[PDB]
Subunit: 73 residues, 3 copies
Amino acid sequence: KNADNINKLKSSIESTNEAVVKLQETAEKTVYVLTALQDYGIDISIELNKAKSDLEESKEWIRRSNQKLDSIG
Amino acid sequence: MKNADNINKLKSSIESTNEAVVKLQETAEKTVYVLTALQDYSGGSGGIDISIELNKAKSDLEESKEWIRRSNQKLDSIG
Amino acid sequence: AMKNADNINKLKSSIESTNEAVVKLQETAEKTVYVLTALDISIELNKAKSDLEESKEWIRRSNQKLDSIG
């Protein structure tokens, strides 16, 4: 019973991780759009760059999670 | 019952994380909506690339929403 | 027993990493909502901010549950 449930938990997180990846892709596009709509504002530029860094870190963490899940056998 | 109890706690944790993702998906939907409304209310004044990327963002979000449904469906099968 | 215990620990670490990813997304959402404001729209952005604050609370709840695993 436990072993089956551990396998189900693993699959659940894999799916959750896919949802997070697709949301990261949504965030990339929203940031692109906001950048494109800028007035060519110094402060908005700063904040958008911080968002980009946060997004890149989000990607690294999801890779970490996926790699951890891969180690379950 | 150590392992059984921890499996219950893991299930609860993922359910909470999944809901966190759902609420963030709602944030994303409102954001894309605001931006698509702005862009569509003008001409494509920002440029056609903005409309395309906003359309792609909407598809991405629909995909993200379906992946949560799949995760929740899997958790639901845990006794 | 120990094999399942180890995989439980791995599942725990994986969810912790996923939660880190979500917190990072929440931080990007914060900055985008802020920037979108600076640039009925008010209503929709207030709902977005409301959803975001709730999202933060669900991660806190998740982390609390993970912390109880020992």
